[PDB]
Structure 1
Amino acid sequence: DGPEKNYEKTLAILQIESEKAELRLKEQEVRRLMRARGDGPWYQFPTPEKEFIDHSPKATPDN
């Protein structure tokens, strides 16, 4: 079919590979940030649930 097809196909292959590469690196930076920051949905480690804290009126008066 021609020189046109491979040149344009190779540029499309490079754009996919360039864009995949930028994203893979950004992942590693985002993943460094959320681990230490803990300010993002990943690496949100658990602590007890307040759904068990008993807020009832207790017997002593200082609960």
Structure 2
Amino acid sequence: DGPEKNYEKTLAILQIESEKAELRLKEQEVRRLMRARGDGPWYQFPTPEKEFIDHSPKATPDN
């Protein structure tokens, strides 16, 4: 084929490889923030299930 194909394929490859490089750097920045701040969907660490708290009236009033 002509030079066009090799040229424009190389442009297509470079774009793919470039978009991937920025996503990989963006994931490290994201993972650094979720882990240190716990305000994101990741690195959520368990806290006791509140559904097993006994809400009934007790033998004593002060509860």
Segments of 5+ residues of structure 1 without an aligned counterpart are: none
Cα root mean square deviation, aligned: 0.5
TM-score by length of 1: 0.97
Query: In structure 2, what is the Cα distance between the partners aligned to 1:17 and 1:54?
Result: 56
Q: Residue by residue, what CA displacement relative to the aligned partner does 1:8-40 show, whole Å, maximum 9, x if unpaired?
A: 000000000000000000000000000001000
1:35 corresponds to 2:17:
no
1:54: Cα distance to partner? Answer: 0.8
- Equivalent residues, number: 63
TM-score by length of 2: 0.97
Segments of 5+ residues of structure 2 without an aligned counterpart are: none
- The sequence identity of aligned pairs, in percent, is 100
Query: In structure 2, what is the Cα distance between the partners aligned to 1:62 and 1:38?
Result: 35
* Shift >2 Å, 4+ stretches: none
